[PDB]
Structure formats: structure tokens, C-alpha cells
Design a protein around this ligand. Sequence first.
Ligand code: ZN
Lengths: 100, 129, 25, 150, 96, 208, 81, 87
Amino acid sequence: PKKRASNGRNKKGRGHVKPVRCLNCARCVPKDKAIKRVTIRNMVEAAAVRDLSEASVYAEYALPKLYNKLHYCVSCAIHARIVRVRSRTDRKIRTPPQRK
Amino acid sequence: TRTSVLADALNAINNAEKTGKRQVLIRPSSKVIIKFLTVMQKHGYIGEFEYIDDHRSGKIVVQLNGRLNKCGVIQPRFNVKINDIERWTDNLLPARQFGYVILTTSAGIMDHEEARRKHVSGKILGFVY
Amino acid sequence: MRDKWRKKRVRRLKRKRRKVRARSK
Amino acid sequence: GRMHSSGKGISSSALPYSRNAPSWFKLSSDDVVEQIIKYARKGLTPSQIGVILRDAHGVSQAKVVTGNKILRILKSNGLAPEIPEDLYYLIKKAVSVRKHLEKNRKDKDSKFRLILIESRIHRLARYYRTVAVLPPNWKYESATASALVA
Amino acid sequence: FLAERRILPKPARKARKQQKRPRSRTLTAVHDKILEDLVFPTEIIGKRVRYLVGGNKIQKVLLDSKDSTAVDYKLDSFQQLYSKLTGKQVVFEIPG
Amino acid sequence: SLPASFDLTPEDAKLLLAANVHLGAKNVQVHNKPYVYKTRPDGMNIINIGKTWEKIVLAARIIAAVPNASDVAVCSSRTFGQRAVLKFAAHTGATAIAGRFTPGNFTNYITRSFKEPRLVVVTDPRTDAQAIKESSYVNIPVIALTDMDSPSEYVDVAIPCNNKGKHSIGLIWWLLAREVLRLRGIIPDRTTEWSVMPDLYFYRDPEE
Amino acid sequence: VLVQDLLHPSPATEAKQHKLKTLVQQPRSFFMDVKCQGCLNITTVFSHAQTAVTCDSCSTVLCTPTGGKAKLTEGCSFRRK
Amino acid sequence: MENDKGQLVELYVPRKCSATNRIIKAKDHASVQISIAKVDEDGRAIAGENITYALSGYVRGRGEADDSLNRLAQQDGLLKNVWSYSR
RNA sequence: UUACUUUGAAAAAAUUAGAGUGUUCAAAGCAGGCCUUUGCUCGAAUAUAUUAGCAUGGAAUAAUAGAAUAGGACGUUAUGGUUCU
RNA sequence: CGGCACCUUACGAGAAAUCAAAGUCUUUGGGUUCUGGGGGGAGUAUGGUCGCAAGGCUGAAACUUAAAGGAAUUGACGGAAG
Ligand SMILES: [Zn+2]
């Protein structure tokens, strides 16, 4: 039967969408279907931000962040637990999970 | 395209009556539509209805009284002999005691009972009950 | 079977039939 | 809608209910006729004549003022063009697209549009032939189109 | 004032051949014209026809609020003269 | 029709406006459109308190038409209305259902508090959706205090008011009690001040 | 809404309707009498004009066509007829 | 419905909805019958004397019961200028 | 100009439906019945056929033609001119 | 006004999943084109036709078989998650 009314992707009023390669396995996956995560991480772990600020020759030097956008295919993301299998009624919920 | 203004009018009436509305707006008007509404009004299936002049085909607003079970057209307008009225009334009406098959004869638009009274027949046009 | 390979199998088999029948032109 | 598209736009003009001239209109039934004839002699098509009339002279409708349509008056005074205006602009558009295709041979949307335009030309010419506006033997020729739309 | 137009009847199917009857000489157009003339100082802004439950049909005409001083006391005379001259019931009204 | 003594008095209009009964929710549904007088430019909708009063009088006449006073069940799941409904039951003799409404009170005849009211009055259709559903299962008419965003499914007579107000709920319930008792005749006439005060019927926090 | 007066809609919603979706369709456009600042000469101009109309007296453009209503130039005053 | 001799052979002529005139079926349990007391000019409820209306389960399910009561009571005088014919 | 529809005429007999008729009943048959007859005497109905053709009434419904370079209609006893019987 | 969609409900539809259309369908008739008649054999053989070829379009029968299949429920299992 039909599993999703959206067919698991985001293509409406469109014929073709150029593919993207999975970060983990390099599989060609359409850009709208790929599980996309935007990550803004600190470049230095919180343990070393102290000794590195003390070792810095600059007074009031801000440590730069590491900006990255990750693309995963469905198998990679499910395997890496980026997304999980949800119940029939919970599939419809499309608000971002309340963690952040 | 728009192939039957009688069909659009009766479909709008059917949808309003099934949804409980006591009025429906019909566009466009015509002579055949007005006389079909006149036969329904004469038999009490609708109340007063109104013709609006817009220097065009026109518009109609019909008042519904809740007595209408279903009204519809028969497309195409088959030629009907006097001997075919029995078959048409058998297929379309729920009983032998009420309901009318509307015909267009050269003597005018009329229900099958008046057509039987003056012994004329024409083309079937619709039904009401 | 995948059905995809079954149709292809017949395609390889239709090809053989055509060349063999062509022998006795 | 949109014979040759998927559009369903309903935009168009909405004529007023009143079929009489406005009370504020002061031009005569003659002065409108001479305005129409002056612009038609200046080369304006009936659409442009009517646009200029309402745009600068307040003639809301030539029918509600003069009593006759613009093309009917021109045909009554011998100033009606031989080819109807809309068929002329369709043939001219087909000529322009065909010249662009001959200079741009790898284009294919324009080839598709040319097929659409030529079918619309043939349908309109067929109508004008059935209503005897064009001769019954009138035929659109791609080779000789430039003469008609020169 | 009213105009004296000529009304050409709708010819029968077996009747002989004649000139094309213009639409101006039809029954509805002349009745509309005399109705419009009945209210000459004003101008009609709309026409409605009522199909009452009894079967009789009642006309209604919407007139402009401009120049309504010139016909407001002659509504009844207009109605009675037009009903005599045509046979249809007409009820004039200015929406105001 | 109705005597002019049933008209909105200036005194009642002062209570309703001072109690912000006329303040309706930002978004109004199509079924609640007739009750909005005008939208305030911030977004609040002004309630036609003349219509609120008239619906109150109609509802009180429906309550007065029920022969057995105990056959009327009054419900409120909101905490703001529990004291109001309890005092309404005390004064009028109705059967109060304060707090949680046990599903099956009208349909399951072996439950403990199985009642058979001829009429159910509800503070809010949204938080009392279960009670309305069962009334629509056992042919119970529903009287509801409705704001402009309240759903109107299975509610026959709607009293337009502010359901989310501390003073609005108490005042409206007091007004209903006063009118039902006026029609029943315990209070001699429509001009004598009632002993009960609108401060009574107001919800009190555990602080005060 | 089961019962509703279709023959007498509220004029507010009648004015909110599309011009083709009224009981009788009616244009929302009008014609204007435009006074240029330079002189005084009545020139009837359509509100939704597609032409850059110039008055006869002085060769000055009165309005510039836009997507909808024509835009009158500065110093030009209009009065609806 | 009557027989040849005229006797009313019909049992249970059913009720009809006051709003839509539909027949209220024998098992339409969402249908209600509102009874509204008549009030004399002294402000007293008249005992055992009521105005009665019936609404079909369709109207109640659609949420049109409130506007239907507004119309029926305004036409019968139970209310003034609360329901408007023109919207 | 039609189309359509009403009525009429037509569609062999046999067959079907169907009226009459105690083949002892019936399937059937088209017989038969009368006070007993040098004879008297009800019958053997009728419907239906159906596309095509024929005649007829009606002009709704659905087509078709008409007066736009007027090549238009009436002058019945309109004014003349060219002819033909 | 036009689009791409979406959220809630189900008057209504449906075997159900579900559906603002897959509704207005035994209360069956708005206009129109195409396709199917249990599963296989089989998109096979043959003939035709297009193609440089690969192949495309059209397209059977003999024979064989009582099911094949659709949606959903409970359980069992999973080198799936909590
Ligand atoms: Zn991957």
C-alpha cells in the first residue's frame, strides 16, 4: 500500500530534482529526499578551551566555530540513528523535535 | 466545456438540498430551465424562484423547501414514444404514486401525467421526486 | 526472479533465435 | 481554458450593465466616427483605436455611443483591412518565430510553439472561411507568409 | 413620452417566406424599450422577475437614486399604463 | 414576543463591560461570526453583548421549560468554572458535574454516577468535548457558553461569552441562575436585588 | 449557513467580491477629469490607462501606464466623473 | 397514507426537523427536541406551556443548530434583532 | 429545409398474447347451440408486429436558410420601356 | 484573482489503506478519448511495419492450473528502533 502521502520526499509541482551524494556512502539521492542536518559546532572541545585561551598570545581572542551541512541517505541516516522508525500516527507530526 | 445548463442547475440544487441549504444560486438561466423550475414549483418541490437580469445569459436564485429528494437530467434527451413512458417511469421513479418524468413535446414542457392526459409525447428532459 | 532479468533472459534468447533462423535464409 | 496551455486565468474586461452613454459624455456620434477614421487612417487597428478612445477621449464604448462596432463602421466606410487583425498578428508571430528558428536550428521549445501557432492559424482561417470573411480557397503558406505580413 | 414601434409576429413553420425579421421587432426588445422610456428622466440599473408560488410572475426594476424626484410620484401611473400596454406586473423600486 | 423588561439593562451592561465579557478571542470561526461586533486593531473581537444578553434570556427560558429541576445537568471541566457550577447547583437545584467528566456517564448504565439528564449545560465545548459527544449519543440538548473560537459541533443554543475569564464565567453563571430563578418565581420580580453576590461564584486560588 | 439572502448581499462583502463574481459584474475602474498644473483643460482619462495621454494645449504627459491604474504625474489633480 | 375506505393505515407519522424539514429517524440519537418556556408579561414562566422545536442529527452534526435556533426563535418572536437574514 | 413526436394506412397465413366454446378435464380443435325440429340459429373476435417507405396534426427540444459593396421586401389598380403566349 | 502545496473534519465515498476528490455512483445518465475480463504459457511464436543495430509498435494459439491477487487483524520471527 501507500506508506506516505508525500512518498517520503518533497517533490510537488516538479518533474526532476538533481541528486546529491550521501556523506557516508556516496549514494546518489535526490536533494529533497536526503536527510539534511545543519551543524554549528565549536572547533575546540570544551576541555581545551581554557588551556588554549591561556596559551593564546592574543588577549580576547574568540575561538572560531566549525560550520558544516551534512547530507545522509535514508539507509545511512537510519543506521546512524539520525532518524528513527516512528509509529503510524507519529509519522504525521512535522514539527522539529523539542530538544534544542 | 459547459454542455448542459439544465444539468448544472439541477446538480447545484441537488447539492444544496443534500447539504440542507434553503437557497441555491443558478447560472446561467434559459427558457428551458425556467419552465423546468416552473413545473417543479407547480408540484411543490421548490418555493418561489427569482430571475436576475444582467444583460447576459442571466442568473437564477432558487428557494428550497426541503421537499426535494433528487432532481436530475437525462442526458442525452432520448426520443420517447408513448409506449416508452412505462419503461422510463419504471426505471426512474421510486413508486407509482408520486414523482414526475418531465418531457419536452411540441405541446410544451410537461410531466408524464399531463402528457398522458393530453396523449402527447416528445423527448425526456429530466425527473423530480 | 527479479523479472527484470527474466525479460533480459528472453531478450538474449530471442536474439539467438533470430540469428539461427537467419542461417536458412 | 487556454486552448493551447494549462492556464485557467479568468482576467478580462467587464462591460458595465448600463447600455447607454454616460451622462458626462459630450462628444457626438459624428465626432467619434471621425476620431476613429483619423486613427484608422493613421494606421491604428480597431483595438488600438478603442484604447486611445477610452484613454484620451472618454469614449467608454463605441457601441454605446455610435451604435455600431468599430470594425463594422470601418467596413461600412471601406477602411476595413483585408486580413482580420487577430489572424494577421498570429501569422506575423509565426513568421517571427520561424525566422528565429531558421537562425537557431537547435531550439526545440520554439519548434513546439511554432506547431501550436500554426494550428491556431489554421483553425482561425477555417472559421473565417466558413463565415466567408476569407475566400474559401484561402490557405496559409509558410513560404509566402512574409508577403502577407510584410 | 413613449415610442410607437412596430411588432412583427413570430412566423409559423408552414407560413410563407418573407424578409428576415430583425431582433429589434421582437416582443422582448420593444417591451424593454418602452419600459426604459417609461422612466426617461431616470435610468434603469437592474431588472428582476419574481416567479411566485402561485404561478404569476412579477417584474421589478432597479432605478438610480439620481433624478428619482422625477418618477417617484408617477410609479403607480407607470405600473398601470405598462400593465395595460403589455400584460405583465411591474413593481418599480429605487434601492436608495 | 417578549416584554421590554427582558431588554439589556444599563446595570447589566456595566457589569458585563467591567468584567470584560465582551472580549472575544483573536480568531473567530464562521459559525461564531454573527456574534462579533467589530475587530479591535490589536486583534481582539468585540462581543455584541446585546446578543449575549438575548441568548442568556433564551437559554434561561429553555431551562425554565424543564419540569424537574434535577433533570438539568451542569458541567465544567475548567477550574475557573467549578465553583460557579457548584454554586449554581446549590441555588437552582440542578445536578453539578465539576472537574473531570467520566466518559460513559450518559451511555454506560452500570457506572457509579450514571445520570439521565434531559438537558446538559456546558462551560466550554473544547474541554468538555466528551460530555457533548455523549449528549449527542443519548439525545441530550446542550447549552454552551461559547467564545468566538469555540467549536459549534453538537451545540444547539450557544451563549456568546468569554470562556477564559475568571470574572466572565462567574458573572455569566450568576446571570443564568438569576434568570432561571426569575422565571421559576422564587425571586418575586425582576427589579429586586438578589441576595447572592457575583463575588460568590468566582473561583478562588489556594492563596487568598 | 443554510438560510441566507442571496438576492441582497451585504454591501461590504459585495465590495470585497471580485468584479466578475458579483451578482451583476461591474468594473471597479472609472473615468477622470485631470487638471495639469500648467493650464486648465478638461481631459477625460481612464483610470487604468495603457497610453501616456498628453493634453492638446501643452505637450505634457498626464499619466504613465502601470500594471493597474495609471499613475498621474506630480501636479496633476483628478476628479472622478 | 390511507386505505380505500379512508382509515389512516399509517402508524408513527414521524417528526421532521425544524431547520431542514428532514425526517428524524427512529434511531437518530443525535436529534433533540428543544422546549422553551413561555413567559407572561409579569416575568413568570407559564407552567406546562412551551414552544417546541426539533433538529435533525445532520444539522446538529454540522454545527448549524445554533443559527437555526436563532432564525426559528427570531421568526417566532422569542428573540429580536439577533439573527440577520442578510449576511 | 428537416430531424423529432401523435394519429391513419401497411406489416400473409402459421406462431405469441388474448375473447368465445364442458374436446368427459386438459394439451387441443374451431367448433357449436336450440323439445328434438322435413329446420331455426351466435361464431371463427382483437391486440401486437416495426427498422424503411406513404398521409396527417403539433412547432417545444436539436439542427438548417435568410436584408451588409443591399444582388433586400412591397406598390395590390405605382410610372414608363424591352420582349414572349 | 491565478498557481505549488498543506492542516482539521467526514455530510459523502470506499474492501480498506485512505480520499475536497478516489464526493455529488442501485435516489445508477454534464461532454469526450484510451484500457481490462481468473493465474500462467506471454509481450512468447508468427505475419506486418519502423530502425544501421540494439530493438520499438501491432500480436496469438496449443497446453496447463483453483486459485493468483488487494487492504487490514492477531501471532511468530528480524543479524530494526525505544
Ligand atoms: Zn548513504
